Amino acid sequence: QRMFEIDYSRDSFLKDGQPFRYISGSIHYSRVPRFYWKDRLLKMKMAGLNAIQTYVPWNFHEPWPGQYQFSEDHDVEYFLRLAHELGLLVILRPGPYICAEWEMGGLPAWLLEKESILLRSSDPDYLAAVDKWLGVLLPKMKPLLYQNGGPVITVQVENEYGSYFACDFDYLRFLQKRFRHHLGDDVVLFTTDGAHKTFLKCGALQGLYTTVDFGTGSNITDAFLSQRKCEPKGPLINSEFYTGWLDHWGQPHSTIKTEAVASSLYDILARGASVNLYMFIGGTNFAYWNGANSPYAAQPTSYDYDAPLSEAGDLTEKYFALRNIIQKFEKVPEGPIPPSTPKFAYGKVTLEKLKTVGAALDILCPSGPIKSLYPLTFIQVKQHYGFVLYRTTLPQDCSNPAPLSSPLNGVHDRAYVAVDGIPQGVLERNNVITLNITGKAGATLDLLVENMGRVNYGAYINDFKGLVSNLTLSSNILTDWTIFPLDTEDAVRSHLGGWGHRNYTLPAFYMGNFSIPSGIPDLPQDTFIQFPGWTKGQVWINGFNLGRYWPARGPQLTLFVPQHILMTSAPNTITVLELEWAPCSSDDPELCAVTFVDRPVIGSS
Amino acid sequence: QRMFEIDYSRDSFLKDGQPFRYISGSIHYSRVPRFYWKDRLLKMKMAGLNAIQTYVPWNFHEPWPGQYQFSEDHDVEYFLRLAHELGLLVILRPGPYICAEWEMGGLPAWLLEKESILLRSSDPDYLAAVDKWLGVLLPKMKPLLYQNGGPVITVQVENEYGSYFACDFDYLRFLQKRFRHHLGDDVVLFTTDGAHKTFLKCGALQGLYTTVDFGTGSNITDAFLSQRKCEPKGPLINSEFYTGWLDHWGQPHSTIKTEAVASSLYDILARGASVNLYMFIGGTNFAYWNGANSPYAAQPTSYDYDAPLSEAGDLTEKYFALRNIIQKFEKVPEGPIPPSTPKFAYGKVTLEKLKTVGAALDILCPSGPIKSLYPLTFIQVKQHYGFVLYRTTLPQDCSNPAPLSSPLNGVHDRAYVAVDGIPQGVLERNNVITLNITGKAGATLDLLVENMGRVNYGAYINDFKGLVSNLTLSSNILTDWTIFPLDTEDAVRSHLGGWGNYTLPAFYMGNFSIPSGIPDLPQDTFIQFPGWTKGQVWINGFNLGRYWPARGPQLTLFVPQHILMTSAPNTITVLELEWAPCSSDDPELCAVTFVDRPVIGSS
Numbered sequence A: 001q002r003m004f005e006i007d008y009s010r011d012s013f014l015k016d017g018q019p020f021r022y023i024s025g026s027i028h029y030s031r032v033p034r035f036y037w038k039d040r041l042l043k044m045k046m047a048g049l050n051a052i053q054t055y056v057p058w059n060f061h062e063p064w065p066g067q068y069q070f071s072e073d074h075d076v077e078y079f080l081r082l083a084h085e086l087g088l089l090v091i092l093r094p095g096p097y098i099c100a101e102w103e104m105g106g107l108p109a110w111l112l113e114k115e116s117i118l119l120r121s122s123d124p125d126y127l128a129a130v131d132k133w134l135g136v137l138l139p140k141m142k143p144l145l146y147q148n149g150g151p152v153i154t155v156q157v158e159n160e161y162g163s164y165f166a167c168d169f170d171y172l173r174f175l176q177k178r179f180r181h182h183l184g185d186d187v188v189l190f191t192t193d194g195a196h197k198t199f200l201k202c203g204a205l206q207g208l209y210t211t212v213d214f215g216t217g218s219n220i221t222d223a224f225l226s227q228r229k230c231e232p233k234g235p236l237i238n239s240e241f242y243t244g245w246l247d248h249w250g251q252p253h254s255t256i257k258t259e260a261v262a263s264s265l266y267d268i269l270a271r272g273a274s275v276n277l278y279m280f281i282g283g284t285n286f287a288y289w290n291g292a293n294s295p296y297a298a299q300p301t302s303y304d305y306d307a308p309l310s311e312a313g314d315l316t317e318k319y320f321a322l323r324n325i326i327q328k329f330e331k332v333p334e335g336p337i338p339p340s341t342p343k344f345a346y347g348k349v350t351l352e353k354l355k356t357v358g359a360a361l362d363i364l365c366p367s368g369p370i371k372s373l374y375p376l377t378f379i380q381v382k383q384h385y386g387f388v389l390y391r392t393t394l395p396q397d398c399s400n401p402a403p404l405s406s407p408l409n410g411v412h413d414r415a416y417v418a419v420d421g422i423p424q425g426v427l428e429r430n431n432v433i434t435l436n437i438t439g440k441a442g443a444t445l446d447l448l449v450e451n452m453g454r455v456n457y458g459a460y461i462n463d464f465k466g467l468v469s470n471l472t473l474s475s476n477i478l479t480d481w482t483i484f485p486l487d488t489e490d491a492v493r494s495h496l497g498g499w500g501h502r503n504y505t506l507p508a509f510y511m512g513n514f515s516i517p518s519g520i521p522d523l524p525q526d527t528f529i530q531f532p533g534w535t536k537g538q539v540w541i542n543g544f545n546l547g548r549y550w551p552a553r554g555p556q557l558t559l560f561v562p563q564h565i566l567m568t569s570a571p572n573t574i575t576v577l578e579l580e581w582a583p584c585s586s587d588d589p590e591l592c593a594v595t596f597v598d599r600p601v602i603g604s605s
Numbered sequence B: 001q002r003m004f005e006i007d008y009s010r011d012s013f014l015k016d017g018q019p020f021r022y023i024s025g026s027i028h029y030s031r032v033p034r035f036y037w038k039d040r041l042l043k044m045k046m047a048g049l050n051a052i053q054t055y056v057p058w059n060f061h062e063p064w065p066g067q068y069q070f071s072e073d074h075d076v077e078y079f080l081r082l083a084h085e086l087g088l089l090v091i092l093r094p095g096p097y098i099c100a101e102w103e104m105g106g107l108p109a110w111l112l113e114k115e116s117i118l119l120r121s122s123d124p125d126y127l128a129a130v131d132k133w134l135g136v137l138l139p140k141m142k143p144l145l146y147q148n149g150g151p152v153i154t155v156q157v158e159n160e161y162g163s164y165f166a167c168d169f170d171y172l173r174f175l176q177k178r179f180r181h182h183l184g185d186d187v188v189l190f191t192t193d194g195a196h197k198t199f200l201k202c203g204a205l206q207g208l209y210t211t212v213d214f215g216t217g218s219n220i221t222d223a224f225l226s227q228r229k230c231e232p233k234g235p236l237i238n239s240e241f242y243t244g245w246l247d248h249w250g251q252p253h254s255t256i257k258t259e260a261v262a263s264s265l266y267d268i269l270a271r272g273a274s275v276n277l278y279m280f281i282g283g284t285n286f287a288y289w290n291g292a293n294s295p296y297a298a299q300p301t302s303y304d305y306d307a308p309l310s311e312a313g314d315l316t317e318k319y320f321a322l323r324n325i326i327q328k329f330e331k332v333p334e335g336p337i338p339p340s341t342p343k344f345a346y347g348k349v350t351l352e353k354l355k356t357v358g359a360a361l362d363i364l365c366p367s368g369p370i371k372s373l374y375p376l377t378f379i380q381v382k383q384h385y386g387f388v389l390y391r392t393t394l395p396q397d398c399s400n401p402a403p404l405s406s407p408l409n410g411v412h413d414r415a416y417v418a419v420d421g422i423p424q425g426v427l428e429r430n431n432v433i434t435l436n437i438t439g440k441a442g443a444t445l446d447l448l449v450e451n452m453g454r455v456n457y458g459a460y461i462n463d464f465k466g467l468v469s470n471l472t473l474s475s476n477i478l479t480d481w482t483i484f485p486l487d488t489e490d491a492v493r494s495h496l497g498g499w500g501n502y503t504l505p506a507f508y509m510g511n512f513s514i515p516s517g518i519p520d521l522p523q524d525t526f527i528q529f530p531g532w533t534k535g536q537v538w539i540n541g542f543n544l545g546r547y548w549p550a551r552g553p554q555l556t557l558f559v560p561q562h563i564l565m566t567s568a569p570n571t572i573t574v575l576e577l578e579w580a581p582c583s584s585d586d587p588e589l590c591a592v593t594f595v596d597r598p599v600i601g602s603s
């Protein structure tokens, strides 16, 4: 009979009747390839952590209603068993909103098919979908509960609900009742909110243990007092002690000094508190999984976060200094630590243009476009992530430049504009709502619109995407739209159909191959791909979407490439979808190339 | 149909009728695990070599008469097909004698069952043995000749015969005849000798193309003049251009500056000469495979050689330097070069004592010992490598110390002496032929004798090993011996039976685990022996070689990752011959350490 509980009498957890305090690190299994789960988890164990904490992003597991992903890189059950086999306990944060610098804070975009839905509230439509998601997810976690022989010792309900405007306590009571129904009356349920009464007001609930979060800039005494007002008795817990911080494109890369982190960790531990390091490994927002903040600013592909373990899982100075801190309180496992992986510079690899997006429309949109008088959103045309091509014809001669505009600032989030196959430039959420264009009356006007990531924090998480309001040309609303949802992922995996089915340039797919020898024990290795002369796009290797590149803005100039998607003898196909400008016109094919390097550049300006 | 031949008009080889010269590197498949054959060969290719050169060590393949090893790490045919697959031609050096700093120059020790055998000569028993061996090896090599669609473009007959005292030309002509019988009339056959008329005199032969060897210290024009005396027409060839040099235990690790090698290499190539770099990768003398020179000094376990590729295959500054030289003459292949392998320090691993050699004789010698009035050699008791225990009892009281001595210096090569289980010290070939001992009359006198490797060069390659002459005690010949050949390789593989200032020779064992499901573990490592003195080491039953931190220059031994497992613990076993750091009550001293860098140049 295995037990995990709060002992209110002695301000402690009890694990099997014995006092217990956790030292945890965040790892998001959705941001680490499964190939490397055990590697990251074993390094976390060797640092002295006795637990890990993760989020379950609902949108990562239920891409459309009733259609679930629980295998391979989506196998949360396996991740938790792996943690358990390593002797680690788990703090599960299943949401249903998780924030987390992740697309729409984890909420599936198809929730937005009800335009007026009030997310994270007792809206009956939101609740009905949450209920259905919890009926699938929770019974899976039940056998992984500590009391049932698994690792899961506590479970978070919602995520900083106190920061949201709605203050719907009915919603939190409904979550609590349903977590209880599926998981039982013994599991420790808790909430997390910023360490201040203003946040705790709407975040805390009778029957859910109130914890706080705070990083190196906060007064430790003040923070735990804010916690003590809601929980006079029980353990002190900091559920997200920030070891670093998130990035945005075009802003320099956030760091926090190792000393500051080590010093605050020591002081937190010295109080007897349980603590979780956010992040311990950050990893990667592969594909389109990044979030954004409001006013609109997308977080980049790397989630390195300046964590103790780097994006590719490397041991850093920070890691060793935090291990050292932990060692002052607990005995840390003996033996050598698993190393930073070897990285290899495969060097320069030439690409060439295969087809423009406009030429590949047949393969990108095999069931045909949707026609509409006025523009429809991504949600309305049944596309959540990536790109949607919006097409109409010019209703006037524009031999002299005519302004193309979105007067309500409804290009969400970027649009690459062409007229009869001539690029005209870019429309941008907030920054540029008007673009002058030229072409003849009746010319085809194309806007390739990119979802740069759904806001994951604040009031404006109901971020539909696409052209969310009208466009005008010379102040006259443009009508008669042909709208092509683009199955970029399928298409890239069929080599735009070539493999069957068993100043600006036009958005286009550029492809290239490189070989790695077989029979070499240390190849393939992890690497980093760099894009000198390119501008902004999406990159795949052998059909695995590595994420977004944007060396024009930085600070990230390289993307992490994990070894297990690379093949020997058989050619590795790189696909680059360049959106703005490719270095491939001049008759110097050598410039139309990418480079594999053996160190990240996520800092260079 | 493919042709390779000497054209005496262009002073050149012709490959398929067109001018060809080779730029080759030596790699010994016997000194690199097969797990790493493709790695080393591809790194060779990426340096711009169009060929490799290798020795076939006879004793690596015919350990006893008519018992053959050609599988796995002994799969020479596969190695040649691998070279070919990668676009490398092959210069084959099948011996039967190869020198090579390799046990007895490759010659099987069982040839010494004829005590009087004149090795590398017309001795009819030596020839009948060689002929039987050629009759197994050469039919295997015939399909791998260039003309039959394989990689092998030239074949060396013997090895520096000009340096051997015998000068038996009928021996050379016999080899020529047998190689021709098995391989045909088209294969280019050649010889290699030192670049000077004194060496060429007894090493060259009509019908065998004469080549020379030399290194960075020699006048290149004069070396090639000495070749031209013998072959006034044909390709200039340096068959062994020294990129480095051999070591001996107790002497400073040898090195040769990159600048010198690159400089000489460029000079050689510029003359249009074909050339082989000796070594390009050297590798390791695992188990007991190392040789020795006269006066007796054994070469160490590492054959790093200061080669362009390190013992563990790492890309060195020398490697990129010679690559850059080769690039001035031939387009080199494109793409990145396979990397130096990652190395991991597994840290400290504690061992404990398992059993002394003395207490282990049931398992080391399950057949029972051999009795003899006087001592017998390793050969006579049918053991070639490792250790033999010689046992007698003292015929007189020795309360006062008495001289135990080998008046004819007949301890080949080192003996660890105990009386009634009390260590007495060491007798050493050429260095310590007397040792005072004490004990009661009737006490057991034990001498654990080590074959430290059979001389591979010079007159004294007929190196039997063991107690090869009598031992005297207080000037009297000791008699009535009880001799135990020791099956160390089996006993270590069975964990010595049990299966679920000096110390007595003894085996120590410990375990360490490596986690599974970690994409980059296990890794290669280097094992180090702080506090130990001299011994042998096995990991998971694989004999990695000899350690001797007491003499150096080699401190660490190379440990290839593929013998390391994650599914069950890895066992280390040390046989320590002189002094183990394990008597103190601190168990933590009884230990070895794995580190991520080699120390082969200790001062």
Ligand SMILES: CCCC/N=C1/SC[C@@H]2[C@H](O)[C@H](O)[C@@H](O)[C@H](O)N12
Pocket: A098, A099, A100, A101, A159, A160, A240, A242, A246
């Ligand atoms: C106003 C400042 C909010 C506190 N800071 C951060 S830094 C990054 C994390 C994640 O967004 C996490 O999901 C959060 O729960 C937390 O929101 N958070």
Ligand SMILES: CCCC/N=C1/SC[C@@H]2[C@H](O)[C@H](O)[C@@H](O)[C@H](O)N12
Pocket: B098, B099, B100, B101, B159, B160, B194, B213, B240, B245, B246
């Ligand atoms: C005394 C020096 C003579 C030339 N040097 C060396 S250095 C190491 C090599 C090998 O022993 C080779 O087998 C021999 O053929 C060659 O002897 N050799």
Ligand SMILES: *[C@@H]1O[C@H](CO)[C@@H](O)[C@H](O)[C@H]1NC(C)=O
Pocket: A219, A220, A221, A222
């Ligand atoms: C933190 O606040 C407490 C009062 O709550 C104060 O006494 C203390 O000096 C403060 N410490 C720091 C480091 O600001």
Ligand SMILES: *[C@@H]1O[C@H](CO)[C@@H](O)[C@H](O)[C@H]1NC(C)=O
Pocket: A401, A403, A434, A435, A436
């Ligand atoms: C568009 O063109 C007009 C001239 O007709 C000019 O006044 C305006 O600045 C231009 N707008 C942009 C956004 O470049």
Ligand SMILES: *[C@@H]1O[C@H](CO)[C@@H](O)[C@H](O)[C@H]1NC(C)=O
Pocket: A374, A375, A376, A468, A469, A470, A477
């Ligand atoms: C477009 O224009 C008309 C206003 O005339 C309005 O009825 C319609 O809602 C607008 N649609 C969008 C998507 O903004």
Ligand SMILES: *[C@@H]1O[C@H](CO)[C@@H](O)[C@H](O)[C@H]1NC(C)=O
Pocket: A495, A512, A513, A571, A573
């Ligand atoms: C890249 O490799 C794939 C798979 O063989 C092939 O379909 C494509 O045509 C290749 N391009 C080149 C230059 O090899």
Ligand SMILES: *[C@@H]1O[C@H](CO)[C@@H](O)[C@H](O)[C@H]1NC(C)=O
Pocket: B219, B220, B221, B222
């Ligand atoms: C080599 O010897 C030749 C004469 O045979 C001499 O002319 C030449 O200078 C020597 N070369 C070197 C580098 O010593």
Ligand SMILES: *[C@@H]1O[C@H](CO)[C@@H](O)[C@H](O)[C@H]1NC(C)=O
Pocket: B401, B402, B436, B437
């Ligand atoms: C060792 O041998 C020498 C030879 O002179 C002898 O005289 C000496 O007494 C011996 N020493 C011991 C400690 O037995």
Ligand SMILES: *[C@@H]1O[C@H](CO)[C@@H](O)[C@H](O)[C@H]1NC(C)=O
Pocket: B374, B375, B467, B468, B469, B470, B477
């Ligand atoms: C040892 O001495 C004996 C008796 O003098 C002699 O017959 C024999 O040849 C010697 N044996 C060896 C191995 O030296």
Ligand SMILES: *[C@@H]1O[C@H](CO)[C@@H](O)[C@H](O)[C@H]1NC(C)=O
Pocket: B510, B511, B512, B569
């Ligand atoms: C294997 O390894 C450990 C060292 O961690 C050792 O203590 C143990 O005795 C070994 N196992 C057995 C069965 O002897």
Ligand SMILES: [Cl-]
Pocket: A026, A027, A053, A054, A055, A093
């Ligand atoms: Cl988390």
Ligand SMILES: [Cl-]
Pocket: B026, B027, B053, B054, B055, B093
């Ligand atoms: Cl060779």
